Amino acid sequence: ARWNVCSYCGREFEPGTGKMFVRNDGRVLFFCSSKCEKYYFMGRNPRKLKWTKAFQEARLQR
């Protein structure tokens, strides 16, 4: 029972939950929720959302 990490929001999600999206070239993505999946594919940028970790990292980048 190990905890996977989300490719959009960077938080950990519990065993028996979420999704693995597989590209044909082999790159694997993990999603905690439909929210994150849908935002990632319609193109919202997580570096501007204060409920993600990429925001903290980009603030460090300011």
């Binding site: 029972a1 519990e14 065993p15 028996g16």
Partner: protein
């Protein structure tokens, strides 16, 4: 001709509201061990675990996802003993003895209780029954029991039930009962982890429903959907017999039915809302509380799978009457993860 099977089953007819909301048990299993053959509690919620598969099949030895329902089981109070003899057609009640010291709140259910009935009269009646049992006139002995829902702040009105006892010797059963009367019973003293159980409850209510939902009939062609007969059936029958058959599907009550569900595994018995792993104790109540319920505080069963009924409802449990040959072993399985995250 095109052949196909009929729409729904005829084995649960008439499809009516249950007589009572407390479920009765019609048949009992054969168990050599002299014990009380079941228990009762209140449904609380669902979650899931991850565990190493113990059942026969492939996936044995593998980690697997398993869903779980939690039943809160405070201790029952054994308030009486009842004797049964053989009648002309079947069993007939001979005599009951009630205990003398009862909780106040039992009068909310049994409005007319005895008044004086001292300890001494109690012992005299038990002696009468012991002599009756020693004579040879008696075919069966059963316990009379009631719930205590004031220890969990759910209610004050109790549920009153009658349970059976395992084994063959009527005298041995009676000795068990004489030990148990006037004392509390806890689920650990009756059930074994890893056992298969049957579960009995009244199903969720849905009211009046039509035949698409009640019997699984087809929706009609889109022309009929625009003609006003989309969710109807076509016809009530042939010219002769010149009457509607009872077998033809129609609308009515759906849900609030009596149902029994076979072979659900008990996976763990807990204590004061906590479960013991290898080293640590963990609260099974999830963050924020079980929805449409609150916080589990007394004692609980984990039963894998799904069970009938709404959340705050009375559930009865017995040992399996119709189990398979290839059983899982009667020990608690090795659990690796229990979900405590919010369920809302």
């Amino acid at each position: 001709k095109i052949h196909r099977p009929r729409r729904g089953s005829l084995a649960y007819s008439p499809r009516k509201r249950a007589k009572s909301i407390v479920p009765r048990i019609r048949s009992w299993p054969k168990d050599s061990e002299v014990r009380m053959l079941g228990f009762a509690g209140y449904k609380a919620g669902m979650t899931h675990i991850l565990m190493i598969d113990d059942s026969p099949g492939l996936t044995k030895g593998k980690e697997i996802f398993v869903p779980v329902t939690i039943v809160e089981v405070p201790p029952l109070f054994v308030y009486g003993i009842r004797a049964y003899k053989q009648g002309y057609l079947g069993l007939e009640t001979a005599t009951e003895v009630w205990f003398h010291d009862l909780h106040k709140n039992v009068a909310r259910r049994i409005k007319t209780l005895p008044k004086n009935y001292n300890e001494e009269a109690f012992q005299a009646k038990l002696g009468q029954l012991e002599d009756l049992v020693n004579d040879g006139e008696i075919a069966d002995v059963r316990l009379l029991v009631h719930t205590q829902p004031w220890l969990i702040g759910l209610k004050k009105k109790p549920e009153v039930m009658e349970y059976a006892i395992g084994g063959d010797d009527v005298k041995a059963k009676f000795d068990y009962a004489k030990e148990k009367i006037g004392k509390e019973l806890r689920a650990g003293e009756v059930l074994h982890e890893g056992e298969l159980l049957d579960v009995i409850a009244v199903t969720k209510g849905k009211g009046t429903q039509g035949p698409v939902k009640r019997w699984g009939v087809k929706v009609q062609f889109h022309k009929a959907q625009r003609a006003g007969k989309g969710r109807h059936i076509g016809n009530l029958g042939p010219w002769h017999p010149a009457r509607v058959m009872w077998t033809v599907p129609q609308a009515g009550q759906m849900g609030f039915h009596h149902r029994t569900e076979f072979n659900k595994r008990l996976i763990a018995i807990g204590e004061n809302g906590k479960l013991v792993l290898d080293g640590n104790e963990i609260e099974i109540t999830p963050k924020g509380g079980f929805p449409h319920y609150g916080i589990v505080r007394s004692d609980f069963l984990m039963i894998e799978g799904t069970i009938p009924g709404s959340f705050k409802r009375i559930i009865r449990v017995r040992p399996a009457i119709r189990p398979p040959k290839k059983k899982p072993p009667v020990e608690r399985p090795q659990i690796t993860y229990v979900s405590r995250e919010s369920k809302q």
